[model samples]
Target: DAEIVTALPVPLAVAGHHQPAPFYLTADMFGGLPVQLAGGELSKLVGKPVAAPHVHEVDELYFLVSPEPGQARIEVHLDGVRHELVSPAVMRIPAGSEHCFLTLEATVGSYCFGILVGD
Candidate 1:
């Protein structure tokens, strides 16, 4: 069966973080596809860390989008190193890498998407 996710569900971890709940597609959602996906719009600035520094066994990718070119800004910490990024950017996190991110500035229509390739 093909699962069509039309409504976003508020994840327990990020329940009060965003105005609109983020969408997540997990391995179970894809019938054991061994990959996970998530995305959400940034209607407000998220000063705090979206998630704690965690290590993933699978490689992950983060893609940031902005309403205007080079307008969005975010701070990411990977393996104890701090990296600031502008909009329309993509970052790859290798397997077993510890990482986390904080949104410093985001436009009304800006959003972030993430992909994890592995179980």
Candidate 2:
């Protein structure tokens, strides 16, 4: 039988491992497949490879789940001037809206979602 190493009162990294310990649920006794999101509340992440920043045909939405609160502003450069974006739990960027981000806190990366618009 597999051990369902349920909620431990302490963080596993505190045990001296550089990362979280695995709570394996398996038949092979090793290599369990961990999931990213608990529910669809926040999907994993979104990224792509591009030769240039193409700002058209889509609106990207970001959901920041990491609780180190800070400002959330999205914008793009236009003739060297910056335009700031307004967002809450959800935002719908206008199609072809250009964007960028700045930060005053320690962070891993941006958490966002996108919905394409227009044909």
Candidate 3:
């Protein structure tokens, strides 16, 4: 039999933003598990660009686009190297690495994506 687990409140707003964008997630959602993973989505951050180049204290996995957008491009500076990432991909930034990203272009019917950070 599966044990009943108390659910954590899912925030409707993005992290630090009132209506759109998410910068972080609370630590109480994982049922006190040892994993440093944080759950979040950036679907709301489309169009509204964020210029904040930030770094995490630990490694973070950024869950990227999927289903294969007809055309989507991501421009990012990871550890000072410029990279252009196509959609339907995933990326990971190690601890202390300077990283930032932006959506350069997208086609009609194309859905913007979000970044999931796992510390």
Candidate 4:
């Protein structure tokens, strides 16, 4: 039997009108997990930078299974700056790291991802 899988969609509208534009996006649907995000746009952010980029705050895994149209960006805020991760990405974290993440933008996809957190 296929274990129940969940989802988390980042729609363009909710990503904040401040988000850059003209891009595509999606995720792997890993389930409830704490994803460790790290990186920087470097050139894209230019003088500016990523935000307080948050982790999901759990020792689980949640893949970005499905993506909406033109996500345009995937930012990871490190020290107040932002970095972009490739879409359809799988945000994962070990049992440690105190990881975390915040709902940047969202689609109508009702996040329902599943995980082996109890195992």
On a 0 to 100 scale, what is the lDDT of residue 82 in model 3?
A: 77
lDDT of 1 by residue, 94-113 (tens): 98888878888887888777
Q: Which tens-of-lDDT digit does each residue in 1-119 have in candidate 3?
A: 66453443333343333343432344444354323333333344454446456676766555555345536666767877878776656677787887777666655434433334444
Model 4 C-alpha lDDT per residue in residues 1-119, reported as the tens digit of each score: 77553332333331222453221222333444332222222223323423232333335454443345424223443335443444355554444333323334434442313232432
As a whole number from 0 to 100, the lDDT of residue 48 in candidate 4 is 44
lDDT of each: 0.74, 0.33, 0.53, 0.35
Candidate 1 versus the native: TM-score?
A: 0.78
- TM-scores for candidates 1 onward, in order: 0.78, 0.31, 0.57, 0.33
Candidate 4 residue 115 Cα shift, in angstroms, is 2.5
Clash pairs detected, candidate 1: none
User: Clashing residue pairs, candidate 2?
Assistant: 61-113, 62-112, 75-99, 75-100
Worst 10 residues of 2 by lDDT: 35-44
**lDDT score at residue 26, model 2, on the 0-100 scale:** 20
TM-score of 3: 0.57
What CA RMSD would you report for each candidate? 3.7, 12.9, 5.1, 11.5
Runs with alpha carbons beyond 4 Å of true place in candidate 1: 1-3, 10-21
| Runs off by more than 4 Å, candidate 3 | 1-20, 23-26, 33-48, 107-119
Select the stronger candidate by lDDT from 1 and 3: 1
